[PDB]
């Protein structure tokens, strides 16, 4: 029915999904797009996850020519791949990819699909990846790059994050410029200051080297080491450097952060501005579908049925009656009952806030199940799982403390840990059964507990079909399933905002984190591509010592990934950068690390700082509002 | 006159000085307190600055017993002092101190002064310092501590900062507790994870050592080094540590910052709340002094004289007339003209914002000077000093570039640099003469340029009475006097907020910076007191190597000061902490460094972060308001 479809569009305004279609032809397109929305979700999340993982599992590129093949010399650690094996997965993921990327046409138009910049770029990368798999099939430099690109444009959350970044990138570049001025001036004045003195051994290459060292001091990664010769010369040399790390770290780095922060909050305000614009598009489509007379208002006899299927289909407001109309005219004192378009949306959002509790969506009998449903809905069940997890925790600390006491009662406790895993798979089956699959998926705690339970059960099939270190490690870890006991702390009035901010930050920071992860992966294929060596023997043991202890990496794609994590945490990065400089030979190999530090450290991480702060402030405001 | 005194109190409401006196007896007390306010300002800023500097120049304490006396063994660098010389300065500064600390009585009451907690603690430290100087005179553990304490309670700005810190300290302790929970849990799970594997060489002392290492990893100061054995064992060990530095650094450290931020803005809102309360106390004292009939309003014939001495004494509103009263009654259309107490303050603050331009406050003739005054007030003079500083800059880059080209035209340029110093002392004398001393002191640019000029002239007397490296260093540095050319950049619409935020941050961050500096000094007398050694020879060269290259310090009070700066910048701090641990011998010597890191790193520096951000946001808001 029209009114039914309208109520549906209203709960999609409240729940907030986004589609842009404008009709009996819009019904076939609606069936098509919803088809796409359900199955392609899991069967394609899997697909692009695995396809992106084909890049850290791919066969390296310097191993194709000389010399010795597959060794511990230049130190890798992951399984790699062959060409024959690589082609079959490149083809499979490329195929499911293709069918997805051309699917939208079925609910869009032909010239519409082919006029959308999104789909056009998606198919351009589709054909770059396809011609690649054809060449990697007959027998490579920009194959993984379309994997990470095609990944980042396959999840709307990372899409919109990248747009936000684009918006802040300009003013960000401005502050980067003023920053560059600071570094240049400080390098010139530092260098002209230590011109005819001992720190000619650290300002040897003069302004060229002193800008290098003043940059690495700007990141504080060499604070005591870099000016130790000058401190040895004079005591009062320090005055300079403490002046410079003072101004540069507490006066400069901070308001760079402030710049990225303000730019961020502005692009976010923009993003939710357009977001509310889309929700308005949907609710307005709806009321446009109830106002049959184009006058822009809806009747009593027309909104009693609309609120009727709202209260019947989505949420639990009240019941209509004869005092429904008598409360209508009694409330108005006028015999009109007409709601305009801009007040209807207000009604769907008042309903969206107060009345709204999205209800539960079999060829079976409730006969044998209606006891377990109503007794699992009892809070007694919640105290049951709570107490069960408590005793569980004591069990785990005893068993593990018996592998660290090395006594052998650890296995008698271990079997009980397995039977505890059984307890939890019971809780999962009875909970998913007694609430329904979608109502089970609606809460993040139950999503996580679900997938952790399923990792427990694949763990169980594996651990019992395969035959300790095969078991204790694969099962103690899921004590993270007791982590939900931390929600207890929110009952304390001191830590509510802390635990709450964190809890809501574990999802909301995930697109920004996945973004900086993809920047990592791109930089990783770059570094693998251009740093395949290790002059292995001499340039290595002369390059670094303890820093080659740290620098046995960057020659696999995983080694590159975790070395990029080390650069991410900033500690001792100039040994990776410095040693790869005196590995290649010229200075134009430092722009990898300066460019890295500047894209990820001054932009992305200042971004995540800003977002965490904004999340916690939001939290404090909500707690203020509840009272 | 009463009305005159009132207008005075109004401009002190606008300018915002603070006194709390409540009368012909309040006039003698007013003369007294103003006496104190002028001379004690310079002659006492000097005093407590020097007295505080008696602590880094004091004779050390482990040098009093054995063994070898005053050597390079255990490495100091500053002049020290003797007892005979120390006593005379302890006594002098203690004496001017005393006369100040008992001065307030003259404008306060006896039981009032002695009932104020401020003055009572001030005199308690007065007598602790005096009994000290008596003992240091006849022949020590808590002498410098009352120097830094007596310093921090001698400047209201640092006083109020410390109160703000007190206010945020509670909730700060709460987040510190939840943090401690994170570290403990992560240490237990990390340790039970690496229990029967190679990283028994890093989790040797078990939970005790693993909490140590997980703490130092929490500060990221050992990211690649600390888990390199486990990474050598398995590749998938990294997953743990990247998980942990992820959660701990981007999820935990950040919302700790957020906590200190919100607590800060709250205590600041409190502080300016009470501040406005004091300004209200002054303006209300004023209007209380004009409303002679206690009815709470002021007449026309009474506020025409009040606005009259406002416009005549402080600022430049308009002129009274017969159309002053005709504009009064013409504006009101009622023959009343009465202003209440709460609207009078509004009038003094509307005057304070729009009309307000505090005017210029000789037994001489303007005859010969009125040409230089009006031609220096011309902007042509501003373009004169601007161009002069530009050509000056080119001169300095040429001369200095000739000490780095080592050609000997550097001295011919150098004399011209001196004559440039002469140019600027001319600008200073003619500017201070043509604007007046107080109008010269009213702008921070002219305060700074004044004291830098005077350092140039003491430099000139010195450099010409003493006889290169005696000159080039002592004069090139004052090219910072051209630093004001950076104000030019504020004419660009991209960098206005940046340069402006910075410019206003060079003062506003100064009390928080001085605060963290005093925390440094206290920690410094602590460390000197308890770390006088260097088991010098063995425990040193076995303790540290490159880290003893860094650790030739902490055995003088300056060495302690700059080593505390190194700890402040956080880089490689665990070598100071670790080596001083295996110097003393037990683990109870790490609480110096954990306690340090926690008081200054998680509290004070998060504070200065928050304040910088708030300053820049304020700036953006003002630029928004001007349009
Ligand atoms: Ba020289
Ligand atoms: Ba030279
Ligand atoms: Ba070196
Ligand atoms: Ba109409
Ligand atoms: Ba619930
Ligand atoms: Ba609640
Ligand atoms: Ba080292
Ligand atoms: Ba074991
Ligand atoms: Ba063991
Ligand atoms: Ba070690
Ligand atoms: Ba930081
Ligand atoms: Ba009255
Ligand atoms: Ba001016
Ligand atoms: Ba202006
Ligand atoms: Ba850092
Ligand atoms: Ca390929
Ligand atoms: Ca209608
Ligand atoms: Ca003494
Ligand atoms: Ca009156
Ligand atoms: Na470091």
């Amino acid at each position: 029915q029209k009114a039914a479809a309208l109520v549906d569009l209203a709960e999609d305004g409240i729940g907030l999904p986004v589609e842009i279609l404008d009709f009996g032809e819009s019904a076939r397109y609606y069936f098509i797009f919803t088809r796409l929305d359900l199955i392609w979700s899991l069967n394609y999340f899997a697909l692009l996850f695995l396809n992106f993982f084909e890049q850290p599992l791919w066969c390296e590129k310097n191993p194709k020519p000389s010399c010795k093949d597959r060794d511990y010399y230049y130190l890798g650690e992951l399984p790699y791949l062959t060409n024959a094996e690589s082609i079959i997965y490149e083809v499979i993921t490329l195929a499911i990819l293709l069918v997805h990327t051309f699917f939208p046409i079925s609910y869009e138009g032909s010239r519409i699909f082919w006029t959308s910049r999104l789909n056009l770029v998606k198919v351009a990368c589709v054909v770059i990846l396809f011609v690649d798999v054809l060449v990697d099939f007959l027998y490579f430099r920009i194959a993984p790059y379309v994997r990470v690109i095609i990944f980042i444009l396959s999840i709307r959350e990372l899409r919109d994050t990248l747009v936000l970044l684009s918006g802040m990138l300009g003013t960000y570049l401005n502050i980067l410029a003023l920053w560059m001025l600071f570094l240049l001036f400080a390098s010139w004045i530092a260098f002209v200051m230590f011109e005819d003195t001992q720190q000619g051994l650290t300002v040897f290459t003069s302004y060229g080297a002193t800008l290098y060292q003043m940059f690495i001091l700007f990141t504080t990664a060499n604070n005591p080491d870099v000016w130790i010769p000058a401190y040895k010369s004079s005591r009062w040399s320090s005055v300079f450097f403490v002046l410079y790390v003072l101004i540069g770290v507490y006066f400069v780095t901070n308001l760079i952060l402030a710049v990225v922060y303000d730019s961020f909050k502005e692009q976010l305000a923009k993003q939710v501005s357009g977001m509310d614009q889309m929700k308005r598009r949907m609710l307005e489509k709806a009321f446009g579908l109830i106002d049959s007379d184009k006058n822009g208002e809806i009747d009593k006899n027309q909104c009693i049925k609309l609120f009727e299927q709202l209260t019947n289909y989505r949420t639990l407001p009240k019941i209509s009656k004869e005092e429904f109309g008598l409360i209508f005219d009694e409330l108005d004192d006028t015999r009109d009952f007409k709601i305009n378009k801009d007040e209807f949306a207000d009604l769907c959002q008042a309903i969206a806030l107060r009345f709204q509790k999205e209800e539960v969506p079999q060829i079976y009998h409730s006969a044998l199940s209606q006891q377990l449903r109503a007794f699992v809905r009892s809070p007694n069940f919640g105290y049951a799982i709570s107490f069960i997890l408590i005793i569980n925790f004591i069990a785990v600390v005893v068993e593990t403390t018996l592998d660290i006491e090395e006594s052998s009662a650890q296995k008698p406790w271990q079997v009980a840990e397995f039977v505890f895993g059984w307890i939890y798979v019971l809780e999962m089956a009875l909970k998913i059964y007694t609430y329904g699959f979608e109502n089970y998926w609606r809460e993040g705690a139950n999503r996580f507990d679900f997938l952790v339970t399923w990792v427990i059960v694949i763990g169980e099939t594996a651990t019992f079909i395969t035959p300790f270190s095969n078991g204790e490690w694969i099962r103690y870890l899921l004590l993270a399933r007791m982590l939900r006991l931390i929600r207890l702390l929110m009952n304390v009035q001191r830590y509510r905002a802390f635990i709450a901010t964190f809890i809501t930050l574990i999802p909301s920071l995930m697109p920004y984190l996945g973004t900086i992860f993809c920047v990592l992966c791109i930089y990783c294929s770059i570094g693998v591509q251009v740093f395949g060596g290790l002059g292995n023997k001499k340039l290595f043991e002369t390059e670094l010592a303890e820093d080659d202890y740290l620098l046995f990496n960057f020659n696999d794609y995983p080694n590159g990934m975790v070395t990029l994590f080390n650069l991410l945490v900033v500690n001792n990065w100039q040994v990776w950068m410095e040693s790869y400089k005196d590995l290649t030979g010229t200075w134009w190999s430092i722009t990898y690390f300066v460019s890295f530090y500047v894209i990820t450290i001054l932009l992305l991480l200042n971004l995540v700082v800003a977002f965490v702060l904004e999340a916690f402030f939001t939290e404090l405001d909500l707690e203020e509002e509840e009272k």
Side-chain angles (χ1 to χ4, degrees), chain A residues 21 211 223 228 233 260-261 286 316 363 386 407 456 504 571 580 610:
Chain A
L21 267 182
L211 180 124
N223 153 72
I228 222 170
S233 214
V260 201
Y261 186 154
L316 34 64
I363 319 180
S386 291
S407 292
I456 278 284
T504 36
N571 207 37
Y580 266 119

Side-chain angles (χ1 to χ4, degrees), chain A residues 325-334 336 338:
Chain A
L326 289 177
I327 264 178
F328 260 148
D329 60 68
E330 164 58 36
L331 174 65
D332 192 25
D333 292 286
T334 325
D336 274 46
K338 40 151 181 178

Side-chain angles (χ1 to χ4, degrees), chain A residues 254-297 299-319:
Chain A
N254 284 333
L255 40 94
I256 299 186
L257 165 71
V259 167
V260 201
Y261 186 154
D262 172 88
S263 309
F264 165 66
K265 222 194 317 179
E266 288 209 324
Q267 247 63 29
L268 180 68
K270 178 93 60 63
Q271 190 170 271
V272 294
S273 193
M275 185 130 20
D276 287 336
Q277 284 160 17
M278 223 301 301
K279 177 187 167 144
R280 162 188 269 197
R281 216 174 209 170
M282 282 231 309
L283 277 183
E284 282 184 359
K285 194 66 164 178
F287 179 83
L289 301 169
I290 214 175
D291 183 44
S292 73
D293 41 344
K294 269 196 176 183
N295 46 15
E297 329 225 4
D299 299 7
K300 182 188 107 297
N301 301 329
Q302 268 182 334
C303 271
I304 61 175
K305 68 167 183 51
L306 163 51
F307 171 81
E308 184 75 32
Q309 307 146 327
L310 175 138
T311 186
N312 279 47
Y313 268 174
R314 311 303 157 165
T315 65
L316 34 64
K318 304 176 269 198
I319 313 177

Side-chain angles (χ1 to χ4, degrees), chain A residues 58 90 132 136 147:
Chain A
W58 217 25
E90 288 183 4
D132 189 276
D136 184 29
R147 304 181 206 277

Side-chain angles (χ1 to χ4, degrees), chain A residues 47-62:
Chain A
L47 174 75
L48 31 109
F49 275 142
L50 294 188
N51 181 13
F52 188 45
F53 293 146
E54 299 286 348
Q55 181 167 344
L57 295 169
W58 217 25
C59 192
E60 274 230 332
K61 295 313 180 57
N62 60 98

